[PDB]
Amino acid sequence: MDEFEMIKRNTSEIISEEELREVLKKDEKSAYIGFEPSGKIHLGHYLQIKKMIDLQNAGFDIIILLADLAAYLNQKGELDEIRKIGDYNKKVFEAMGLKAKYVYGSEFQLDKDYTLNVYRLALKTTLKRARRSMELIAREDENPKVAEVIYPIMQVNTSHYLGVDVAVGGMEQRKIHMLARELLPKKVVCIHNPVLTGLDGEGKMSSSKGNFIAVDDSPEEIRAKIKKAYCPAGVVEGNPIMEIAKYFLEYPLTIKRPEKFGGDLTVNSYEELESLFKNKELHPMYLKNAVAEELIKILEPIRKRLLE
Amino acid sequence: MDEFEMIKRNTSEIISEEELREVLKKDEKSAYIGFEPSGKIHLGHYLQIKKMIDLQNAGFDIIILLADLAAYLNQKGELDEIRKIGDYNKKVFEAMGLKAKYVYGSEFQLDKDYTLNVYRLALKTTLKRARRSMELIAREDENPKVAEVIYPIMQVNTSHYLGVDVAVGGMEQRKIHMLARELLPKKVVCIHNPVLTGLDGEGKMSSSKGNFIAVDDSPEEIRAKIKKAYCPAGVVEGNPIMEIAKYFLEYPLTIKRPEKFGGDLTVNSYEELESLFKNKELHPMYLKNAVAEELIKILEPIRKRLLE
Ligand SMILES: N[C@@H](Cc1ccc(O)c(I)c1)C(=O)O
Ligand SMILES: N[C@@H](Cc1ccc(O)c(I)c1)C(=O)O
């Protein structure tokens, strides 16, 4: 697996692969991802940080935007408290093994030159397009605020301002990124990560929906969350436990199981696991026990650094 | 007529009269009006400048905002060319006899602190409310831009920033002013001037509709415009010529007319003129001739200063 394939592994899409290939040739290249500060950092965040680590290993300088101003526009509270959560998020990201340059949006997104560019972009972006770009990001509001449409153009300008070669985000960010690629002078290569399913199988995993596993959850808590998670036999689509096996576990994977139920099985790839589960040769209970124990070991050093 | 009544004369509404009364008691009070720079300065502009002059005579310090940034957000062109028109507008306003402090929006509306307040206001203003406030101001656009909703909150913040006691504008500005009075810590007294009717009777007078008399039009041009203007006998409502008699002429007004048609008539007030015209005792032709000649003399010193 070369660098391109390492970067591509477990991503939903890369816009565009040809452009990424041109970027990889350079000695100096940079990539960023931004996150509205979150009280709990979960597997969805970890999935993306893992991807930033892949880029870093491929020679990219990484910038992590603690998107405080965006969170502010998206009704997450006052800037002061939001920045505090941002500082906590930085510590968690560092505990994940990512060394990068962390910047707070408000450090530069209120500067006269930034603002003028935001207003120039506002002249080129239709209200309809801006609202559509925020469908999967905007905080639920029966009476949508003007702030909601300022948010996407502020995000489009970040890539321009940072001068990055690559922007990373979950698939929820794809419409904002399409806007950026259409409006900015320089097209940024966009790498989109899949959106994890919530533990109960209802909708996507989210900090606001309480359907996630946080990276610092205790082992006992992880086991309890996985035990009650949606995981119908033979069903892979929308199955959060299979998603965890695909995105976080390493193979070969040894699945412990009593001899009376088939004995231990060693799966050499997620594809093999997917095969077994689909044919109902692996019961949800044993898939769950293996995923919980392996996930606990994966997260252990992060929780340990955060509690130390 | 005291100061309050002088300020109130020919206005559509004052929000609120009690508040204006409290303001008038102060030794130091200020008022502003903003205009998106216009290629031609017309009677609608003059009507408002006349009102600013009334306020100045009542002891107010006047600030005229050459609203370049707003015009930019409202698709009037590039800031550089817009500012140039703004400078021309200042010269016309000075030729009207107004001495005031002229400021360009872009001088302060892109500052970090201004912008943060704009975003704070964006969190409190619904998209629906912002669009409604722009119905009579926004440039026609089949695909409304995000810029359209940034415009009203930028305008709400101007009063806050300038610290004025009074904001003046045409009735088209009333929804933005209502928003300002609801959102700002200090309620600004809003004085609204009537919207003049276009010369052809179709819709309101506008720089973009070419249905106006510019203050520097030649006498010959004024006569031609008034000659072809909508002015049905006995009809006062939506009659631009009667509006001109009401808002710009001084009384007693002598209306020249051949003896065979009734001879000259001296009207001591606009109300008397309105009475005569309604009862069809004054023919459109003679109302028009008198209005054109008197308007020419009213505008003469302005055109002269602009051509000198
Ligand atoms: N939209 C991201 C946060 C984010 C990302 C990048 C960026 O430039 C900005 I401004 C904000 C989220 O949903 O968390
Ligand atoms: N809306 C006015 C222009 C204007 C006025 C005041 C203000 O604070 C701003 I920002 C702009 C117009 O229609 O010309």
PDB file of all heavy atoms in Angstrom, chain B residues 41-47 136 172 194-214 225 240-241 243-244 248 295:
ATOM      1  N   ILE B  41     -28.654  61.971  -8.004  1.00  0.00           N
ATOM      2  CA  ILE B  41     -29.288  62.309  -6.734  1.00  0.00           C
ATOM      3  C   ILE B  41     -30.603  62.965  -7.138  1.00  0.00           C
ATOM      4  O   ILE B  41     -30.608  63.955  -7.886  1.00  0.00           O
ATOM      5  CB  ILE B  41     -28.409  63.263  -5.909  1.00  0.00           C
ATOM      6  CG1 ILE B  41     -27.126  62.532  -5.472  1.00  0.00           C
ATOM      7  CG2 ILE B  41     -29.178  63.737  -4.702  1.00  0.00           C
ATOM      8  CD1 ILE B  41     -27.402  61.261  -4.640  1.00  0.00           C
ATOM      9  N   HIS B  42     -31.712  62.395  -6.664  1.00  0.00           N
ATOM     10  CA  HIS B  42     -33.031  62.866  -7.052  1.00  0.00           C
ATOM     11  C   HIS B  42     -33.859  63.482  -5.937  1.00  0.00           C
ATOM     12  O   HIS B  42     -33.366  63.653  -4.823  1.00  0.00           O
ATOM     13  CB  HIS B  42     -33.811  61.723  -7.718  1.00  0.00           C
ATOM     14  CG  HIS B  42     -33.852  60.456  -6.922  1.00  0.00           C
ATOM     15  ND1 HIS B  42     -34.560  60.338  -5.745  1.00  0.00           N
ATOM     16  CD2 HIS B  42     -33.294  59.243  -7.149  1.00  0.00           C
ATOM     17  CE1 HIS B  42     -34.438  59.105  -5.284  1.00  0.00           C
ATOM     18  NE2 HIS B  42     -33.676  58.420  -6.118  1.00  0.00           N
ATOM     19  N   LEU B  43     -35.111  63.815  -6.246  1.00  0.00           N
ATOM     20  CA  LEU B  43     -35.983  64.435  -5.253  1.00  0.00           C
ATOM     21  C   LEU B  43     -36.199  63.593  -4.003  1.00  0.00           C
ATOM     22  O   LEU B  43     -36.419  64.145  -2.913  1.00  0.00           O
ATOM     23  CB  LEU B  43     -37.331  64.790  -5.868  1.00  0.00           C
ATOM     24  CG  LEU B  43     -37.264  65.791  -7.018  1.00  0.00           C
ATOM     25  CD1 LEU B  43     -38.693  66.050  -7.469  1.00  0.00           C
ATOM     26  CD2 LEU B  43     -36.598  67.092  -6.581  1.00  0.00           C
ATOM     27  N   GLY B  44     -36.152  62.270  -4.151  1.00  0.00           N
ATOM     28  CA  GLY B  44     -36.311  61.401  -2.988  1.00  0.00           C
ATOM     29  C   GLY B  44     -35.148  61.641  -2.047  1.00  0.00           C
ATOM     30  O   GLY B  44     -35.325  61.727  -0.823  1.00  0.00           O
ATOM     31  N   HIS B  45     -33.936  61.750  -2.598  1.00  0.00           N
ATOM     32  CA  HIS B  45     -32.785  62.051  -1.749  1.00  0.00           C
ATOM     33  C   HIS B  45     -32.944  63.438  -1.125  1.00  0.00           C
ATOM     34  O   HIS B  45     -32.711  63.622   0.065  1.00  0.00           O
ATOM     35  CB  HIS B  45     -31.456  62.072  -2.529  1.00  0.00           C
ATOM     36  CG  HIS B  45     -31.039  60.745  -3.083  1.00  0.00           C
ATOM     37  ND1 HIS B  45     -31.150  60.428  -4.422  1.00  0.00           N
ATOM     38  CD2 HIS B  45     -30.550  59.639  -2.474  1.00  0.00           C
ATOM     39  CE1 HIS B  45     -30.754  59.181  -4.611  1.00  0.00           C
ATOM     40  NE2 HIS B  45     -30.386  58.676  -3.443  1.00  0.00           N
ATOM     41  N   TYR B  46     -33.315  64.414  -1.952  1.00  0.00           N
ATOM     42  CA  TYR B  46     -33.453  65.795  -1.485  1.00  0.00           C
ATOM     43  C   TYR B  46     -34.448  65.913  -0.331  1.00  0.00           C
ATOM     44  O   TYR B  46     -34.192  66.631   0.634  1.00  0.00           O
ATOM     45  CB  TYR B  46     -33.867  66.703  -2.667  1.00  0.00           C
ATOM     46  CG  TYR B  46     -33.793  68.196  -2.359  1.00  0.00           C
ATOM     47  CD1 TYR B  46     -32.861  68.704  -1.437  1.00  0.00           C
ATOM     48  CD2 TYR B  46     -34.653  69.100  -2.993  1.00  0.00           C
ATOM     49  CE1 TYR B  46     -32.794  70.092  -1.151  1.00  0.00           C
ATOM     50  CE2 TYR B  46     -34.591  70.473  -2.712  1.00  0.00           C
ATOM     51  CZ  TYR B  46     -33.658  70.951  -1.791  1.00  0.00           C
ATOM     52  OH  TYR B  46     -33.595  72.297  -1.515  1.00  0.00           O
ATOM     53  N   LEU B  47     -35.565  65.195  -0.436  1.00  0.00           N
ATOM     54  CA  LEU B  47     -36.596  65.196   0.602  1.00  0.00           C
ATOM     55  C   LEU B  47     -35.965  64.812   1.940  1.00  0.00           C
ATOM     56  O   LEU B  47     -36.228  65.427   2.973  1.00  0.00           O
ATOM     57  CB  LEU B  47     -37.671  64.170   0.261  1.00  0.00           C
ATOM     58  CG  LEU B  47     -38.791  63.950   1.290  1.00  0.00           C
ATOM     59  CD1 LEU B  47     -39.643  65.201   1.402  1.00  0.00           C
ATOM     60  CD2 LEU B  47     -39.641  62.760   0.853  1.00  0.00           C
ATOM     61  N   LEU B 136     -38.120  45.816   0.147  1.00  0.00           N
ATOM     62  CA  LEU B 136     -38.141  47.059  -0.615  1.00  0.00           C
ATOM     63  C   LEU B 136     -36.777  47.682  -0.825  1.00  0.00           C
ATOM     64  O   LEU B 136     -36.681  48.805  -1.288  1.00  0.00           O
ATOM     65  CB  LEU B 136     -39.039  48.077   0.095  1.00  0.00           C
ATOM     66  CG  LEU B 136     -40.455  47.541   0.297  1.00  0.00           C
ATOM     67  CD1 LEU B 136     -41.284  48.511   1.125  1.00  0.00           C
ATOM     68  CD2 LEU B 136     -41.078  47.314  -1.083  1.00  0.00           C
ATOM     69  N   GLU B 172     -39.116  52.634   3.413  1.00  0.00           N
ATOM     70  CA  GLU B 172     -38.600  51.319   3.002  1.00  0.00           C
ATOM     71  C   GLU B 172     -37.704  50.741   4.083  1.00  0.00           C
ATOM     72  O   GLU B 172     -37.546  49.516   4.183  1.00  0.00           O
ATOM     73  CB  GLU B 172     -37.763  51.395   1.718  1.00  0.00           C
ATOM     74  CG  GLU B 172     -38.507  51.883   0.526  1.00  0.00           C
ATOM     75  CD  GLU B 172     -38.277  53.350   0.303  1.00  0.00           C
ATOM     76  OE1 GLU B 172     -37.990  54.066   1.303  1.00  0.00           O
ATOM     77  OE2 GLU B 172     -38.387  53.778  -0.871  1.00  0.00           O
ATOM     78  N   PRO B 194     -41.747  59.841   3.701  1.00  0.00           N
ATOM     79  CA  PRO B 194     -42.589  59.160   2.712  1.00  0.00           C
ATOM     80  C   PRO B 194     -41.801  58.787   1.462  1.00  0.00           C
ATOM     81  O   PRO B 194     -40.754  59.381   1.161  1.00  0.00           O
ATOM     82  CB  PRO B 194     -43.678  60.201   2.412  1.00  0.00           C
ATOM     83  CG  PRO B 194     -42.971  61.498   2.622  1.00  0.00           C
ATOM     84  CD  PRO B 194     -42.135  61.257   3.858  1.00  0.00           C
ATOM     85  N   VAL B 195     -42.324  57.808   0.726  1.00  0.00           N
ATOM     86  CA  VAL B 195     -41.685  57.360  -0.495  1.00  0.00           C
ATOM     87  C   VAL B 195     -42.413  58.049  -1.627  1.00  0.00           C
ATOM     88  O   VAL B 195     -43.627  57.931  -1.747  1.00  0.00           O
ATOM     89  CB  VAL B 195     -41.817  55.840  -0.657  1.00  0.00           C
ATOM     90  CG1 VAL B 195     -41.124  55.390  -1.934  1.00  0.00           C
ATOM     91  CG2 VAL B 195     -41.197  55.144   0.563  1.00  0.00           C
ATOM     92  N   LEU B 196     -41.670  58.794  -2.428  1.00  0.00           N
ATOM     93  CA  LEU B 196     -42.268  59.511  -3.548  1.00  0.00           C
ATOM     94  C   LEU B 196     -42.670  58.564  -4.669  1.00  0.00           C
ATOM     95  O   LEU B 196     -42.038  57.528  -4.888  1.00  0.00           O
ATOM     96  CB  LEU B 196     -41.276  60.530  -4.102  1.00  0.00           C
ATOM     97  CG  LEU B 196     -40.819  61.623  -3.136  1.00  0.00           C
ATOM     98  CD1 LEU B 196     -39.933  62.626  -3.876  1.00  0.00           C
ATOM     99  CD2 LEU B 196     -42.058  62.336  -2.595  1.00  0.00           C
ATOM    100  N   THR B 197     -43.705  58.946  -5.400  1.00  0.00           N
ATOM    101  CA  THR B 197     -44.175  58.148  -6.516  1.00  0.00           C
ATOM    102  C   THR B 197     -43.369  58.483  -7.774  1.00  0.00           C
ATOM    103  O   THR B 197     -42.966  59.624  -7.965  1.00  0.00           O
ATOM    104  CB  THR B 197     -45.629  58.458  -6.786  1.00  0.00           C
ATOM    105  OG1 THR B 197     -46.405  58.068  -5.646  1.00  0.00           O
ATOM    106  CG2 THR B 197     -46.114  57.719  -8.033  1.00  0.00           C
ATOM    107  N   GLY B 198     -43.134  57.489  -8.625  1.00  0.00           N
ATOM    108  CA  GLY B 198     -42.406  57.748  -9.859  1.00  0.00           C
ATOM    109  C   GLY B 198     -43.215  58.683 -10.750  1.00  0.00           C
ATOM    110  O   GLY B 198     -44.439  58.761 -10.642  1.00  0.00           O
ATOM    111  N   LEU B 199     -42.539  59.381 -11.654  1.00  0.00           N
ATOM    112  CA  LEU B 199     -43.210  60.327 -12.539  1.00  0.00           C
ATOM    113  C   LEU B 199     -44.349  59.731 -13.379  1.00  0.00           C
ATOM    114  O   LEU B 199     -45.323  60.423 -13.667  1.00  0.00           O
ATOM    115  CB  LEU B 199     -42.167  61.004 -13.437  1.00  0.00           C
ATOM    116  CG  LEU B 199     -41.272  62.011 -12.701  1.00  0.00           C
ATOM    117  CD1 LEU B 199     -40.053  62.365 -13.556  1.00  0.00           C
ATOM    118  CD2 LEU B 199     -42.072  63.258 -12.365  1.00  0.00           C
ATOM    119  N   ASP B 200     -44.248  58.455 -13.754  1.00  0.00           N
ATOM    120  CA  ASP B 200     -45.297  57.846 -14.576  1.00  0.00           C
ATOM    121  C   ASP B 200     -46.440  57.254 -13.766  1.00  0.00           C
ATOM    122  O   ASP B 200     -47.393  56.699 -14.330  1.00  0.00           O
ATOM    123  CB  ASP B 200     -44.705  56.782 -15.518  1.00  0.00           C
ATOM    124  CG  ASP B 200     -44.047  55.642 -14.776  1.00  0.00           C
ATOM    125  OD1 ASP B 200     -44.098  55.635 -13.532  1.00  0.00           O
ATOM    126  OD2 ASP B 200     -43.475  54.747 -15.441  1.00  0.00           O
ATOM    127  N   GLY B 201     -46.347  57.378 -12.444  1.00  0.00           N
ATOM    128  CA  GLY B 201     -47.405  56.889 -11.581  1.00  0.00           C
ATOM    129  C   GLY B 201     -47.298  55.418 -11.254  1.00  0.00           C
ATOM    130  O   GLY B 201     -48.045  54.909 -10.424  1.00  0.00           O
ATOM    131  N   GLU B 202     -46.367  54.734 -11.907  1.00  0.00           N
ATOM    132  CA  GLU B 202     -46.163  53.308 -11.676  1.00  0.00           C
ATOM    133  C   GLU B 202     -45.095  53.052 -10.624  1.00  0.00           C
ATOM    134  O   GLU B 202     -43.905  53.188 -10.884  1.00  0.00           O
ATOM    135  CB  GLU B 202     -45.743  52.595 -12.972  1.00  0.00           C
ATOM    136  CG  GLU B 202     -46.877  51.942 -13.739  1.00  0.00           C
ATOM    137  CD  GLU B 202     -47.549  52.886 -14.705  1.00  0.00           C
ATOM    138  OE1 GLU B 202     -46.869  53.350 -15.646  1.00  0.00           O
ATOM    139  OE2 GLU B 202     -48.756  53.161 -14.523  1.00  0.00           O
ATOM    140  N   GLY B 203     -45.512  52.682  -9.429  1.00  0.00           N
ATOM    141  CA  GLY B 203     -44.530  52.387  -8.410  1.00  0.00           C
ATOM    142  C   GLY B 203     -43.799  53.587  -7.862  1.00  0.00           C
ATOM    143  O   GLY B 203     -44.023  54.733  -8.265  1.00  0.00           O
ATOM    144  N   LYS B 204     -42.897  53.301  -6.940  1.00  0.00           N
ATOM    145  CA  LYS B 204     -42.121  54.320  -6.267  1.00  0.00           C
ATOM    146  C   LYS B 204     -40.953  54.860  -7.078  1.00  0.00           C
ATOM    147  O   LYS B 204     -40.416  54.176  -7.953  1.00  0.00           O
ATOM    148  CB  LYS B 204     -41.628  53.758  -4.933  1.00  0.00           C
ATOM    149  CG  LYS B 204     -42.767  53.284  -4.021  1.00  0.00           C
ATOM    150  CD  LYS B 204     -43.705  54.438  -3.665  1.00  0.00           C
ATOM    151  CE  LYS B 204     -44.681  54.062  -2.554  1.00  0.00           C
ATOM    152  NZ  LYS B 204     -45.514  55.227  -2.125  1.00  0.00           N
ATOM    153  N   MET B 205     -40.589  56.105  -6.789  1.00  0.00           N
ATOM    154  CA  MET B 205     -39.482  56.772  -7.454  1.00  0.00           C
ATOM    155  C   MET B 205     -38.215  56.032  -7.079  1.00  0.00           C
ATOM    156  O   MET B 205     -38.033  55.661  -5.920  1.00  0.00           O
ATOM    157  CB  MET B 205     -39.385  58.233  -7.004  1.00  0.00           C
ATOM    158  CG  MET B 205     -38.263  59.016  -7.690  1.00  0.00           C
ATOM    159  SD  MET B 205     -38.158  60.777  -7.218  1.00  0.00           S
ATOM    160  CE  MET B 205     -39.544  61.488  -8.090  1.00  0.00           C
ATOM    161  N   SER B 206     -37.344  55.811  -8.056  1.00  0.00           N
ATOM    162  CA  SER B 206     -36.114  55.076  -7.807  1.00  0.00           C
ATOM    163  C   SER B 206     -35.030  55.414  -8.810  1.00  0.00           C
ATOM    164  O   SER B 206     -35.304  55.677  -9.978  1.00  0.00           O
ATOM    165  CB  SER B 206     -36.388  53.575  -7.878  1.00  0.00           C
ATOM    166  OG  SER B 206     -35.222  52.878  -8.262  1.00  0.00           O
ATOM    167  N   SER B 207     -33.790  55.406  -8.343  1.00  0.00           N
ATOM    168  CA  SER B 207     -32.667  55.666  -9.211  1.00  0.00           C
ATOM    169  C   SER B 207     -32.606  54.578 -10.290  1.00  0.00           C
ATOM    170  O   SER B 207     -32.219  54.848 -11.416  1.00  0.00           O
ATOM    171  CB  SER B 207     -31.371  55.635  -8.412  1.00  0.00           C
ATOM    172  OG  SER B 207     -31.333  56.702  -7.487  1.00  0.00           O
ATOM    173  N   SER B 208     -32.989  53.353  -9.948  1.00  0.00           N
ATOM    174  CA  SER B 208     -32.901  52.276 -10.934  1.00  0.00           C
ATOM    175  C   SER B 208     -34.056  52.225 -11.931  1.00  0.00           C
ATOM    176  O   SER B 208     -33.938  51.599 -12.983  1.00  0.00           O
ATOM    177  CB  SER B 208     -32.748  50.915 -10.230  1.00  0.00           C
ATOM    178  OG  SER B 208     -33.893  50.569  -9.465  1.00  0.00           O
ATOM    179  N   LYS B 209     -35.157  52.900 -11.612  1.00  0.00           N
ATOM    180  CA  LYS B 209     -36.333  52.910 -12.482  1.00  0.00           C
ATOM    181  C   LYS B 209     -36.436  54.081 -13.468  1.00  0.00           C
ATOM    182  O   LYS B 209     -37.344  54.115 -14.279  1.00  0.00           O
ATOM    183  CB  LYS B 209     -37.597  52.834 -11.623  1.00  0.00           C
ATOM    184  CG  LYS B 209     -37.720  51.509 -10.867  1.00  0.00           C
ATOM    185  CD  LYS B 209     -37.959  50.348 -11.834  1.00  0.00           C
ATOM    186  CE  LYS B 209     -37.823  48.985 -11.158  1.00  0.00           C
ATOM    187  NZ  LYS B 209     -36.393  48.611 -10.911  1.00  0.00           N
ATOM    188  N   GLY B 210     -35.501  55.026 -13.404  1.00  0.00           N
ATOM    189  CA  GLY B 210     -35.531  56.170 -14.307  1.00  0.00           C
ATOM    190  C   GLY B 210     -36.863  56.907 -14.337  1.00  0.00           C
ATOM    191  O   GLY B 210     -37.348  57.321 -15.397  1.00  0.00           O
ATOM    192  N   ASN B 211     -37.457  57.087 -13.165  1.00  0.00           N
ATOM    193  CA  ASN B 211     -38.751  57.758 -13.067  1.00  0.00           C
ATOM    194  C   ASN B 211     -38.641  58.934 -12.096  1.00  0.00           C
ATOM    195  O   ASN B 211     -39.589  59.259 -11.383  1.00  0.00           O
ATOM    196  CB  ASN B 211     -39.807  56.750 -12.571  1.00  0.00           C
ATOM    197  CG  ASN B 211     -39.411  56.085 -11.264  1.00  0.00           C
ATOM    198  OD1 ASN B 211     -38.374  56.407 -10.687  1.00  0.00           O
ATOM    199  ND2 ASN B 211     -40.239  55.158 -10.783  1.00  0.00           N
ATOM    200  N   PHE B 212     -37.491  59.592 -12.107  1.00  0.00           N
ATOM    201  CA  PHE B 212     -37.257  60.684 -11.173  1.00  0.00           C
ATOM    202  C   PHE B 212     -36.783  61.963 -11.821  1.00  0.00           C
ATOM    203  O   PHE B 212     -36.424  62.006 -12.991  1.00  0.00           O
ATOM    204  CB  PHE B 212     -36.164  60.259 -10.184  1.00  0.00           C
ATOM    205  CG  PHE B 212     -34.882  59.885 -10.860  1.00  0.00           C
ATOM    206  CD1 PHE B 212     -34.032  60.868 -11.370  1.00  0.00           C
ATOM    207  CD2 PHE B 212     -34.572  58.543 -11.096  1.00  0.00           C
ATOM    208  CE1 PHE B 212     -32.907  60.537 -12.104  1.00  0.00           C
ATOM    209  CE2 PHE B 212     -33.447  58.190 -11.833  1.00  0.00           C
ATOM    210  CZ  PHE B 212     -32.608  59.185 -12.345  1.00  0.00           C
ATOM    211  N   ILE B 213     -36.790  63.011 -11.013  1.00  0.00           N
ATOM    212  CA  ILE B 213     -36.252  64.291 -11.413  1.00  0.00           C
ATOM    213  C   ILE B 213     -34.971  64.360 -10.568  1.00  0.00           C
ATOM    214  O   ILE B 213     -35.030  64.191  -9.339  1.00  0.00           O
ATOM    215  CB  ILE B 213     -37.178  65.443 -11.008  1.00  0.00           C
ATOM    216  CG1 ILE B 213     -38.392  65.478 -11.931  1.00  0.00           C
ATOM    217  CG2 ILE B 213     -36.413  66.755 -11.027  1.00  0.00           C
ATOM    218  CD1 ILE B 213     -39.409  66.497 -11.524  1.00  0.00           C
ATOM    219  N   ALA B 214     -33.822  64.562 -11.212  1.00  0.00           N
ATOM    220  CA  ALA B 214     -32.561  64.677 -10.472  1.00  0.00           C
ATOM    221  C   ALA B 214     -32.409  66.134 -10.081  1.00  0.00           C
ATOM    222  O   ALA B 214     -32.855  67.021 -10.813  1.00  0.00           O
ATOM    223  CB  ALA B 214     -31.385  64.240 -11.355  1.00  0.00           C
ATOM    224  N   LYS B 225     -40.103  66.444 -18.105  1.00  0.00           N
ATOM    225  CA  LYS B 225     -40.465  65.330 -17.232  1.00  0.00           C
ATOM    226  C   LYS B 225     -41.828  65.558 -16.570  1.00  0.00           C
ATOM    227  O   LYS B 225     -42.633  64.642 -16.441  1.00  0.00           O
ATOM    228  CB  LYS B 225     -39.399  65.137 -16.151  1.00  0.00           C
ATOM    229  CG  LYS B 225     -38.088  64.542 -16.702  1.00  0.00           C
ATOM    230  CD  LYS B 225     -37.058  64.309 -15.600  1.00  0.00           C
ATOM    231  CE  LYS B 225     -35.919  63.427 -16.104  1.00  0.00           C
ATOM    232  NZ  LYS B 225     -34.898  63.138 -15.035  1.00  0.00           N
ATOM    233  N   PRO B 240     -47.572  62.145  -8.546  1.00  0.00           N
ATOM    234  CA  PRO B 240     -46.252  62.727  -8.277  1.00  0.00           C
ATOM    235  C   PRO B 240     -46.156  64.237  -8.326  1.00  0.00           C
ATOM    236  O   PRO B 240     -45.340  64.813  -7.621  1.00  0.00           O
ATOM    237  CB  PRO B 240     -45.348  62.040  -9.307  1.00  0.00           C
ATOM    238  CG  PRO B 240     -46.278  61.850 -10.471  1.00  0.00           C
ATOM    239  CD  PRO B 240     -47.554  61.350  -9.789  1.00  0.00           C
ATOM    240  N   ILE B 241     -46.979  64.899  -9.146  1.00  0.00           N
ATOM    241  CA  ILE B 241     -46.910  66.344  -9.210  1.00  0.00           C
ATOM    242  C   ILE B 241     -47.475  66.972  -7.935  1.00  0.00           C
ATOM    243  O   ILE B 241     -46.941  67.965  -7.454  1.00  0.00           O
ATOM    244  CB  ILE B 241     -47.660  66.872 -10.448  1.00  0.00           C
ATOM    245  CG1 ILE B 241     -47.122  66.143 -11.696  1.00  0.00           C
ATOM    246  CG2 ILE B 241     -47.483  68.379 -10.563  1.00  0.00           C
ATOM    247  CD1 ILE B 241     -45.592  66.225 -11.843  1.00  0.00           C
ATOM    248  N   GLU B 243     -47.412  65.509  -5.082  1.00  0.00           N
ATOM    249  CA  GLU B 243     -46.426  65.200  -4.043  1.00  0.00           C
ATOM    250  C   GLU B 243     -45.326  66.258  -4.080  1.00  0.00           C
ATOM    251  O   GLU B 243     -44.879  66.731  -3.030  1.00  0.00           O
ATOM    252  CB  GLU B 243     -45.816  63.814  -4.261  1.00  0.00           C
ATOM    253  CG  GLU B 243     -46.786  62.656  -4.092  1.00  0.00           C
ATOM    254  CD  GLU B 243     -46.121  61.326  -4.417  1.00  0.00           C
ATOM    255  OE1 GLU B 243     -45.019  61.361  -5.010  1.00  0.00           O
ATOM    256  OE2 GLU B 243     -46.693  60.265  -4.088  1.00  0.00           O
ATOM    257  N   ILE B 244     -44.872  66.630  -5.283  1.00  0.00           N
ATOM    258  CA  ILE B 244     -43.833  67.645  -5.374  1.00  0.00           C
ATOM    259  C   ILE B 244     -44.329  68.960  -4.775  1.00  0.00           C
ATOM    260  O   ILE B 244     -43.605  69.627  -4.038  1.00  0.00           O
ATOM    261  CB  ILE B 244     -43.385  67.842  -6.840  1.00  0.00           C
ATOM    262  CG1 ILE B 244     -42.702  66.562  -7.319  1.00  0.00           C
ATOM    263  CG2 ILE B 244     -42.441  69.042  -6.956  1.00  0.00           C
ATOM    264  CD1 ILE B 244     -42.449  66.534  -8.828  1.00  0.00           C
ATOM    265  N   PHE B 248     -41.923  70.050  -1.642  1.00  0.00           N
ATOM    266  CA  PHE B 248     -40.858  70.975  -1.999  1.00  0.00           C
ATOM    267  C   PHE B 248     -41.203  72.447  -2.132  1.00  0.00           C
ATOM    268  O   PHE B 248     -40.336  73.295  -1.937  1.00  0.00           O
ATOM    269  CB  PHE B 248     -40.191  70.514  -3.301  1.00  0.00           C
ATOM    270  CG  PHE B 248     -39.654  69.125  -3.221  1.00  0.00           C
ATOM    271  CD1 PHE B 248     -40.422  68.040  -3.636  1.00  0.00           C
ATOM    272  CD2 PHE B 248     -38.411  68.895  -2.628  1.00  0.00           C
ATOM    273  CE1 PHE B 248     -39.961  66.743  -3.455  1.00  0.00           C
ATOM    274  CE2 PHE B 248     -37.940  67.587  -2.444  1.00  0.00           C
ATOM    275  CZ  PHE B 248     -38.717  66.518  -2.851  1.00  0.00           C
ATOM    276  N   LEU B 295     -40.230  74.479  -8.934  1.00  0.00           N
ATOM    277  CA  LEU B 295     -39.220  73.450  -8.640  1.00  0.00           C
ATOM    278  C   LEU B 295     -37.892  73.882  -9.281  1.00  0.00           C
ATOM    279  O   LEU B 295     -36.816  73.727  -8.694  1.00  0.00           O
ATOM    280  CB  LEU B 295     -39.648  72.090  -9.202  1.00  0.00           C
ATOM    281  CG  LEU B 295     -39.442  70.764  -8.453  1.00  0.00           C
ATOM    282  CD1 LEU B 295     -39.059  69.712  -9.461  1.00  0.00           C
ATOM    283  CD2 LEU B 295     -38.407  70.848  -7.330  1.00  0.00           C
TER     284      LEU B 295
END
